[PDB]
């Protein structure tokens, strides 16, 4: 079964390709409309694997340097191995002497295509956590935030260095450990500062500080300072917004680490309760009169800050990524915080982007501690300053990558001229990564082809490591195997890989021509792989291998991911942020929400994302990725308002109501960005949330019409 | 053979001392500042508040130009009045505020002639008629006395205060009580010399003696603390912190105060927290290895801090060396040899950058006064570091090469003294005159943007402003010349108040009257300040020339117009000017108007500043030291020995003398100095047994060491700075310095030489 | 008036 193949290769190598059999020629591949691409998760959970404690063993050819893998031919009685990528003959290291056909090194076993090594680097660095805290918020909020911060500080490793910076009208860099007096360096929240200037001003040397100290040494002090922390003193005049120097506070935080611990794992965690109102990085004026930019405003070019503010954070993001530091943004406010302008920070470094109403919500508190989830051994499921390199067979080339990363601009034979997304390299830097982090790597064609992924990173344990995954798919003659190729199609993967290219463009100088291109490709794919007689819509039928692709597109093109005008620019940035990170599974739910129906007549069963699914005697659980909604049908809504639930007679009815609630509870823990919850019913104020989720190829129409206009264009 | 300074000082004490000087007559000539008499107001202002170069002005401009006698007034608005003398009365004129002439704006005083039954009073300064406001009307009686006079101080007294109504206040709202900001230089130098700890430790004691009116129970003045070294360390001392917080600003260049609330608190309320911080500061920087410091930023900060609390204030800055750290006001080591006919010598006495002058304006603009306690040990560029405090109306205290086991007491005395000083804040002095003449020039620790308002961010009982007048028109030998000094200011309790000083001088068409009414000390005070201000504008040789020639001119005029016929071999000097030459020569010998050979620019700039603030008592003593013979002392039954001329000629190898100018106090010992005394004073048996380098207070002694300490105390009494004691062993010891204060000797020219010179040019004016 | 013989 091709399905088992897809499932087993993702579980083993955390890899999912659009096609699992590749066209042996650039031409037929070009008109295969969906590029040979792959959704790739470098640190996929793999508990069944030992960390193997020794260096990786690489090909001796400088331009190659591939890692010894199962695809390599080995001549034990000559202690040599041929590199499957460049054919170079290589010698083994002395410690391998015993190597034999029946007792071979783990890296050579098929079961170990995809394995982890444990580098003997030397500098065992402690994790660094720098809290950058906004103080312009109500006492409820700030108190909650202070509690959430204390909580995390308790989960940090004793060796981890912690740093605290607070801001409002001015920016404060706290000197910790300093007992008996407690001091801090203050700067104008109105002017920028370089890493040097800061190093000079803070009176620091070059390359534990008074600012970044051990958790096991500061605990008392920091936990005291946190608790004694009060909101920004400077009073706020009526009709005005507080003076929040978010842009400068972050700049000072980046600089602080840039001149003390460059090139080592670290999280710069900034919490904000409102928009930056005193740049650089300034997002909106201080007079409440003016509302924070909208998508319309920004389009009518009536947003005077967006370009300047964004340019600022972008600069910061590239510095931090270049320095190997991660930037997380936790923004909780009743209105926009400026995420749009700041997105590149957590987007470019693998940082987190968290939205919310107030830190004083279970939504936030929960989300924040999930950030510090530990593995079976009590270590954060966090990786730092990873370097990703991808080797490909000579018949293949790398177009580029789309996802949390930054190009290292490492040229080579594997790079392609025609680049996609973050291209022109065979190496990317991912400062922050988790077992979930997934990237889209696009390839280009120019017996099996092979690709290897090498991810070096700093494990939360301080242990330096290299994760290696080598895969090989079969080459195919498209003029004699179109079938063998079309059967290898992965519609779910293709769907997401394509959505990732569409969304990437939607940011670029490209406007609504996205839907256009997106639709043009759907049609082309239908034309090349659909069954049909020319000019006969009704005859069009897709193999079960493709049947769902058209529907995926239907839901993509109409998603908040490409139709921003119904959300604020912040939310839009938020959704995209998470989508471009996700693995296949979660990605699908994002693009096409799941809908389950509950009723007395049978167990819960997924149902069409259609109105037809909304029935009076049925309860619905709609799982978009960002929210979990439960909808009571008209009949059920009444029995509930009547109270039958309490009566001992209706034991079952009480269960029916609870069935969906129970499952919502599981998701409301298992899912990282904790989703918003919604309990509604027929005619409820919030039914809207469900109803809404339920030339150009078409417009705001139904899946049926969409399929019709599609079927007819595919056949002419 | 001339009448000596001592003889003149003594004769006046004999004829006028221990007698009541009632200021009831018009152009009345008062006793010398050197004479101790009791003063009773009675119409005209006390000679303690204001003295004049002449108490009879020449009637016309030409007459004035004939005599060339500068017409000026020395005014010490808040001079300390003796406990045995009547205090000032506070006059309140209600809602309307103090009654004033609609034209010249002079305040209601003994100089307003009430007419027409007492419904209209004609102003005594410009002759304009006014309408006695309703609430103030009162009946005249026989010749106008108005049955009020003796009952209301503003009608019968020369000095008194008025309550100021809101339109006398900034932004038309009641001002706030001032605040004291202590700023300590904590760079290496002051950490080592133990100054930082000294200041912090001692500060815990003195913060208690902070001034507060009797009408209140606790001072309305709050306090703030800061430390620095190229970087500023502000401290939060709110009355709700068990521990003080520290906020460091490194953005010198665009300095700012990182606080409000927590900076400037009631010392009583936040007592333990402040003390806490004070105990800490010394340790905190103990290991600091910083040597470079900033300066302008410090003043900039304190001012900014005050502007924010929207209150006037005073900065107590404790600095040690030349501020070289990069930042505005950065000072270089520009001490150059451009000083004799350089014609460019003035530049040495002016601040380096243009920032200091601006900072001074900003301070005055916000009623911020800065007082500087300086502890240099090498060049410091006083012309620069002292500008803001001079212009801001503050005080400069310099302790060269400070050493704890010696200067501790001198400094702690100055500091205590300064914190307890009676002081006004955010003040502006205006000097109105009667028709005919007007104030045209001012000299003092002041700042002026227009040509009538003397702005003093702070003013104290020691400061004196010297005011020069010029003829506007012609005066009447009948009305004479009137003067009204008015000072608007804010009190330590935050009250807007007006202090008034009225003085009526005589006027005359006769030159005899002009001279008969002069006061040498007053004239000397003017000339000194006038010359010292000129240093920053003209070649010293030009200044000295002007002085000598004006001196010869004044005397030549008297010779050719008043003096009865006498031989040409004689030089005639009016009684009023007997000792004017001696003093004039002293001014000319002074280091400020002299040159390079020894004496640092830092010493010249300093002295030049100290004089600018002086009153007549101070300048008299400064230019003519007091030399007291100690070996001939009468045992326990003393009262300060008779002074002896400032010349070596009056020193004896067998004697021991005391010389003081108000800043320095020298204890001179001759070689054949009686061992009996050297024992009863320095506790050691012989002359060769004393070590100069140990200039500390010697106690013990029963008859003498006590009788000497008694006089050293009485001398310091009325003196603002606590003098630096310096012991001098006769033959070839430090004595070289000492010799400088024997102003009658050659050391420039001697007293006789100068007399000889004046006569030559007086004869040159062939007559 | 004080007179002095300059001779
Ligand atoms: Zn190779
Ligand atoms: Zn008048």
DSSP string, A700-712: S--HHHHHHHHHH
- Structural tokens at position B203: 């500060």
Paired residues of A579 in beta bridges: none
Q: Which of A674, A580, A623 is nearest to A354 (CA)?
A: A674
- Structural tokens at position A12: 């083993």
Q: How many helices (H) and strands (E) does chain A have?
A: 21, 28
The burial class, CB within 10 Å (0-12 / 13-18 / 19+), for A54 is middle
Experimental approach was: X-ray
Q: Which CATH number characterizes residue B107's domain? A: 2.30.30.380
Residue B17 lies in a domain: no
Task: State which residues form the domain around A179.
Answer: 125-381
The burial class, CB within 10 Å (0-12 / 13-18 / 19+), for A102 is exposed
- Give me the torsion for CA of B703, B705, B707, B709, rounded to 10°: -160
CB within 8 Å of B547: residues ≥ 6 apart = B527, B531, B584, B587, B588
Residues B497 and B516 reside in one and the same domain: no
Q: Which of B312, B260, B222 is nearest to A235 (CA)?
A: B260
Chains interfacing with B (3 or more CB pairs < 8 Å): A, C
Q: Which of A337, A309, A376, A398 is nearest to A571 (CA)?
A: A337
Domain limit, last residue, from B491, B507, B523:
B507
Residues A466 and A609 reside in one and the same domain: no
Residues A141 and A94 reside in one and the same domain: no
Interface test with B, best of A168, A172, A181 (most B CBs within 10 A): A181
The burial class, CB within 10 Å (0-12 / 13-18 / 19+), for B549 is middle
User: Which residues of chain B are within 8 Å of residue A184 when distances are taken between CB atoms?
Assistant: 245-248
Residue B22 lies in a domain: no
Residue B190 lies in a domain: yes
Domain limit, last residue, from A381, A397, A413:
A381
Query: CA A20: distance to chain centroid?
Result: 24
Determine phi and psi for B587, rounding to 5 degrees: -65, -45
Q: What is the CA(B103)–ligand 2 centre distance, in A?
A: 5
CA atoms of B555 and B571, how far apart (whole Å): 9
> Is residue B123 annotated as involved in ligand binding?
yes
CA angle at residue A318 from A312 to A323, to 5 degrees? 130
Domain limit, last residue, from B507, B541, B567:
B507
Side-chain-side CA neighbours of residue A85 (13 Å): 27
CB within 8 Å of B732: residues ≥ 6 apart = none
Residues A358 and A404 reside in one and the same domain: no
What's the domain count of chain B?
A: 5
CA atoms of A428 and A102, how far apart (whole Å): 37
CA atoms of B533 and A98, how far apart (whole Å): 99
**Residue A329 in contact with residue A354, Cβ under 8 Å?**
yes
The residue with tokens 């004999």 is B14
CA angle at residue A649 from A643 to A653, to 5 degrees? 60
Q: Which CATH number characterizes residue A613's domain? A: 3.40.20.10
Residues A313 and A428 reside in one and the same domain: no
CA angle at residue A522 from A521 to A524, to 5 degrees? 60
User: Of B250, B258, B261, which is closest to A170 when you measure between CB atoms?
Assistant: B258
How far is B379 from chain A, CA to nearest CA, in Å?
28
> Is residue A86 annotated as involved in ligand binding?
yes
With CA atoms as reference, the chain B residue closest to C7 would be: B569
How far is C6 from chain B, CA to nearest CA, in Å?
6
User: Of B3, B569, B756, which is closest to C2 when you measure between CB atoms?
Assistant: B3
The burial class, CB within 10 Å (0-12 / 13-18 / 19+), for A147 is middle
Q: What is the CA(B55)–ligand 1 centre distance, in A?
A: 110
Residues B247 and B258 reside in one and the same domain: yes
According to the 3-state scheme, what is the secondary structure of A468-516?
A: EEEEEEEEECHHHHHHHHHCCECHHHHHHHHHHHHHHHHHCCCCCHHHH
Residues A28 and A57 reside in one and the same domain: no
The number of residues in chain C equals: 7
Residues B603 and B732 reside in one and the same domain: no
User: Which residues of chain C are within 8 Å of residue B569 when distances are taken between CB atoms?
Assistant: 5-7
With CA atoms as reference, the chain B residue closest to C3 would be: B572
Task: State which residues form the domain around B115.
Answer: 33-44+88-157
What's the domain count of chain A?
A: 5
Residues B337 and B308 reside in one and the same domain: yes
**Residue B381 in contact with residue B322, Cβ under 8 Å?**
yes
DSSP letter (8 states) at residue B641: P
Helix, strand, or coil here: B496? strand
**Residue B679 in contact with residue B703, Cβ under 8 Å?**
no
CB atoms within 10 A of CB B330: 18
Domain limit, last residue, from A476, A495, A523:
A476
Residue B56 lies in a domain: yes
Q: Which CATH number characterizes residue A370's domain? A: 3.40.50.410
Residues A389 and A483 reside in one and the same domain: no
- Give me the torsion for CA of B524, B526, B527, B529, rounded to 10°: 120
Residues A129 and A215 reside in one and the same domain: yes
User: Which residues of chain B are within 8 Å of residue A202 when distances are taken between CB atoms?
Assistant: 250
Residues A93 and A231 reside in one and the same domain: no
**Residue B384 in contact with residue B536, Cβ under 8 Å?**
no
CA atoms of B71 and B517, how far apart (whole Å): 11
Q: What is the CA(A57)–ligand 1 centre distance, in A?
A: 11
Could you tell me the CA-to-CA distances from A489 to A16, A715, B230 in Å, in that order?
11, 21, 69
Residues A200 and A306 reside in one and the same domain: yes
CA angle at residue A206 from A201 to A212, to 5 degrees? 70
Q: What is the CA(B486)–ligand 2 centre distance, in A?
A: 14
Residues B300 and B439 reside in one and the same domain: no
Residues B433 and B479 reside in one and the same domain: yes
Pairing of strands A627-632, A676-681: parallel
User: Which residues of chain A are within 8 Å of residue B260 when distances are taken between CB atoms?
Assistant: 233-234
CB within 8 Å of B392: residues ≥ 6 apart = B360, B363, B364, B368, B369, B370, B445, B447, B457, B458
Q: Are chains B and A in touch, 3+ Cβ pairs below 8 Å?
A: yes
Query: CA A168: distance to chain centroid?
Result: 30
Query: Is some CB atom of chain C closer than 8 A to the CB atom of B365?
Result: no
Q: What is the CA(A89)–ligand 1 centre distance, in A?
A: 8
Q: What is the CA(A303)–ligand 2 centre distance, in A?
A: 63
Determine phi and psi for A466, rounding to 5 degrees: -130, 120
Helix then strand then coil, % of chain C, to nearest 5:
0, 55, 45
Pairing of strands B50-52, B72-75: antiparallel
CA atoms of B60 and B477, how far apart (whole Å): 10
Nearest ligand to the C-alpha of residue B435? 2
Residues A437 and A551 reside in one and the same domain: no
Could you tell me the CA-to-CA distances from A648 to A632, A638, A655 in Å, in that order?
21, 18, 12
Query: CA A393: distance to chain centroid?
Result: 28
Residues B105 and B141 reside in one and the same domain: yes
Residues A513 and A564 reside in one and the same domain: yes
Residues A246 and A170 reside in one and the same domain: yes
- State whether C1 and B571 contact (CB < 8 Å): no
Could you tell me the CA-to-CA distances from B208 to A325, A429, B181, B204, B243 in Å, in that order?
53, 63, 15, 8, 21
Residue B200 lies in a domain: yes
How far is B359 from chain A, CA to nearest CA, in Å?
21
CA atoms of A41 and A63, how far apart (whole Å): 25
Resolution (angstroms) stands at 2.7
């Amino acid at each position: 079964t091709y399905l088992e193949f897809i499932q087993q290769n993702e579980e083993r190598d955390g890899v999912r390709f659009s096609w699992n059999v590749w066209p042996s020629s650039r031409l037929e591949a070009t008109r295969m409309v969906v590029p040979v691409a792959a959704l790739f998760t470098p640190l996929k959970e793999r508990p069944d694997l030992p960390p193997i404690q020794y260096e990786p063993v690489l090909c001796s050819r400088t331009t190659c340097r591939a890692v010894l893998n199962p695809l390599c031919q080995v001549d034990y009685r000559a202690k040599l191995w041929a590199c499957n990528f460049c054919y170079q003959r290589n010698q083994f290291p002395p410690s391998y002497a015993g190597i034999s056909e029946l007792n071979q090194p783990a890296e050579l076993l098929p079961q170990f295509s995809s394995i982890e090594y444990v580098v003997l680097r030397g500098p065992q660095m402690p994790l660094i956590f720098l809290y950058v805290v906004d103080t312009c918020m109500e006492d409820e909020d700030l108190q909650a935030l202070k509690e959430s911060m204390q909580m995390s500080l308790s989960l940090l490793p004793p060796t981890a260095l912690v740093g605290l910076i607070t801001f409002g009208r001015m920016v404060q860099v706290h000197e910790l450990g300093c007992e008996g007096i407690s001091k801090s360096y203050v700067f104008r929240g109105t002017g920028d500062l370089s890493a040097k200037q800061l190093q000079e001003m803070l009176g620091l040397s070059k390359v534990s500080n008074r600012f970044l100290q051990p958790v096991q040494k500061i605990d008392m002090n920091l936990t005291d300072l946190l608790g004694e922390l009060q909101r920004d003193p400077w009073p706020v005049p009526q009709g005005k917004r507080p003076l929040r120097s978010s842009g400068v506070a972050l700049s000072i935080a980046v600089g602080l680490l840039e001149c003390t611990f460059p090139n080592t794992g670290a999280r710069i965690m900034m919490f904000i309760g409102g928009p930056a109102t005193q740049g650089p990085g300034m997002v909106v004026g201080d007079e409440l009169k003016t509302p924070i930019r909208s998508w319309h405003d920004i389009d009518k070019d009536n947003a005077k800050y967006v370009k300047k503010g964004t340019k600022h954070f972008e600069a910061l993001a590239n510095r931090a990524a270049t320095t190997g530091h991660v930037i997380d943004i936790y923004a909780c406010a009743l209105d926009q915080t400026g995420l749009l302008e700041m997105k590149c920070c957590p987007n470019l470094t693998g940082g987190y982007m968290v939205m919310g109403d107030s830190f004083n919500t279970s939504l936030f508190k929960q989300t924040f501690q999930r950030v510090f989830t530990k593995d079976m051994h009590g270590q954060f499921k966090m990786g730092f300053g990873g370097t990703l390199e991808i080797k490909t067979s000579r018949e293949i080339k790398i177009s580029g990558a789309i996802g949390p990363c930054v190009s290292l601009n490492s040229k080579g034979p594997c790079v392609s001229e025609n680049e996609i997304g973050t291209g022109g390299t065979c190496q990317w830097k991912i400062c922050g990564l988790s077992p979930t982090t997934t990237l889209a790597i696009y390839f280009e064609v120019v017996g099996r082809g092979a690709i290897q992924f090498v991810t070096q990173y700093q494990h939360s344990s301080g242990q330096r490591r290299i994760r290696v995954t080598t895969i090989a798919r079969n080459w195919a003659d498209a003029q004699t195997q179109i079938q063998n190729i079309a059967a290898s199609f992965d519609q779910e993967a293709a769907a997401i890989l394509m959505a990732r290219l569409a969304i990437y463009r939607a940011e670029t100088e490209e406007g609504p021509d996205v839907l256009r291109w997106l639709d043009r490709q759907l049609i082309r794919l239908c034309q090349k792989f659909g069954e049909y007689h020319k000019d006969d819509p009704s005859s069009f039928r897709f193999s079960e291998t493709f049947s769902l692709y058209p529907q995926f597109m239907f839901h993509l093109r109409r998603s908040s991911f490409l139709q921003v005008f119904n959300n604020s620019p912040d939310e839009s940035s938020y959704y995209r942020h998470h989508f471009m990170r996700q693995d296949l599974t979660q990605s699908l739910i994002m693009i096409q929400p799941i809908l389950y129906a509950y009723s007395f007549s049978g167990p819960p069963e997924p149902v069409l994302l259609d109105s037809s699914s909304i029935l009076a005697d049925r309860i619905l659980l709609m799982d978009t990725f960002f929210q979990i909604l439960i909808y009571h049908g008209e009949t059920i809504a009444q029995w509930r308002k009547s109270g039958y639930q309490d009566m001992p007679e209706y034991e079952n009815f009480r269960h029916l109501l609870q069935a969906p609630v129970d499952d919502a509870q599981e998701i409301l823990h298992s899912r990282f960005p904790m989703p918003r919850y919604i309990d509604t019913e027929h005619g409820g104020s919030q039914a809207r949330f469900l109803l809404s989720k339920v030339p150009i190829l078409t417009d705001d129409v139904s899946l049926q019409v969409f399929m019709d206009h599609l079927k007819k264009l595919a056949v002419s | 053979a001339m009448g000596s300074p001592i003889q003149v000082i003594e004769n006046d004490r004999a004829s006028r001392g221990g007698q009541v000087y009632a200021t009831n007559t018009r152009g009345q000539i008062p006793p010398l500042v050197t004479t101790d008499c009791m003063i009773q107001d009675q119409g005209n202002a006390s000679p303690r508040f204001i003295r004049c170069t002449t108490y009879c002005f020449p009637c016309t401009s030409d007459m004035a130009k004939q005599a060339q006698i500068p017409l000026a007034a020395v005014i010490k608005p808040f001079a300390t009045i003796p406990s045995n003398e009547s205090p000032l009365y506070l006059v309140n004129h209600g809602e309307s505020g103090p009654v004033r002439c609609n034209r010249c704006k002079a305040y209601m005083c003994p100089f307003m002639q009430f007419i027409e039954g007492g419904r209209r009073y004609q102003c005594g300064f410009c002759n304009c008629v006014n309408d006695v406001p309703p609430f103030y009307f009162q009946h005249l009686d026989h010749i106008g006395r108005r049955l009020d006079h003796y009952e209301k101080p503003e009608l019968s007294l020369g000095s008194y205060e008025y309550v100021a109504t809101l339109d006398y206040c900034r932004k038309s709202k009641p001002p706030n009580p001032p605040a004291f900001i202590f700023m300590i230089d904590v760079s290496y130098s002051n950490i080592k010399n133990g100054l930082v700890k000294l200041i912090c430790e001692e500060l815990k004691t003195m913060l208690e003696k902070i001034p507060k009116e009797e009408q209140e129970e606790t001072s309305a003045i709050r306090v703030g603390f800061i430390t620095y070294n190229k970087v500023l360390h502000f401290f939060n001392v709110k009355s709700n912190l068990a521990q003080p917080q520290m906020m460091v600003v490194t953005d010198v260049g665009e300095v700012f105060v990182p606080l409000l609330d927590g900076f400037l608190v009631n010392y009583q309320e936040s007592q333990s927290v402040i003390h806490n911080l004070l105990d800490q500061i010394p340790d905190m920087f103990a290991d600091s290895n910083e040597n470079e410091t900033v300066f302008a930023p410090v003043i900039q900060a304190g001012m900014e801090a005050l502007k924010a609390a929207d209150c006037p204030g005073k900065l107590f800055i404790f600095h040690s060396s030349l501020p070289t750290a990069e930042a505005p006001g950065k000072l270089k080591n520009r001490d150059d040899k451009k000083l004799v006919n350089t014609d460019k010598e003035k530049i040495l006495f002016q601040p380096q950058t243009n920032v200091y002058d601006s900072l001074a304006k900003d301070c005055v603009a916000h009623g911020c006064s800065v007082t500087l306690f300086l502890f240099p040990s090498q060049y410091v560029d006083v012309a620069s570091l002292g500008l803001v405090p001079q212009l801001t109306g503050g005080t400069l205290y310099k302790y060269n090469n400070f050493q704890m086991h010696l200067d501790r007491q001198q400094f702690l005395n100055d500091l205590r003294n300064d914190i307890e000083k009676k002081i006004g804040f955010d003040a502006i002095m205006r000097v109105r005159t009667s028709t005919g003449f007007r104030a045209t020039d001012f000299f003092g620790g002041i700042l002026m943007n227009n040509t009538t308002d003397v702005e003093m961010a702070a003013i104290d009982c020691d400061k004196a402003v010297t005011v020069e007048f010029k003829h506007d028109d012609k005066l009447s030998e009948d009305s004479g010349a009137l003067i009204q000094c008015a000072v608007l200011y804010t009190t330590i309790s935050g009250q807007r108040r007006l202090r008034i000083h009225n003085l009526g001088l005589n006027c005359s068409s006769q030159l005899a009257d002009l001279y008969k009414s002069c006061e040498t000390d007053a004239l000397i005070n003017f000339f000194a300040k006038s010359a010292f201000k000129a240093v920053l504008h003209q070649p010293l040789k030009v200044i000295r020339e002007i002085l000598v020639n004006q001196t010869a001119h004044m005397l030549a005029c008297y010779r050719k117009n008043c003096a009865s016929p006498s031989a040409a071999s004689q030089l005639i000097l009016p009684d009023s000017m007997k000792v004017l030459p001696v003093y004039m020569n002293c001014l000319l010998k002074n280091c400020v108007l002299l040159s390079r050979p020894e004496i640092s620019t830092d010493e010249r700039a300093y002295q030049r500043q100290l004089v600018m603030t002086m009153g007549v008592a101070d300048s008299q003593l400064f230019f003519y030291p007091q030399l007291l013979p100690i070996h001939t002392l009468d045992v326990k039954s003393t009262m300060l020995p008779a002074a002896v001329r400032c010349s070596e000629s009056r020193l004896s190898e067998e004697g021991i003398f005391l010389l003081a100018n108000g800043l320095h106090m020298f204890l001179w010992l001759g070689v054949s100095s009686p061992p009996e005394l050297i024992q009863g004073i320095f506790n050691v048996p012989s002359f060769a047994h004393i070590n100069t380098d140990m200039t500390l207070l010697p106690e013990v002694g029963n008859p003498y060491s006590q009788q000497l300490r008694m006089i050293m105390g009485i001398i310091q009494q009325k003196r603002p700075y606590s003098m630096k004691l310096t012991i001098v062993k006769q033959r070839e010891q430090p004595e070289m310095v000492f010799r400088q204060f024997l102003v009658e000797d050659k050391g420039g020219s001697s007293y006789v030489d100068f007399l000889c010179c004046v006569h030559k040019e007086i004869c040159q004016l062939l007559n | 008036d004080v007179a002095i013989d300059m001779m």
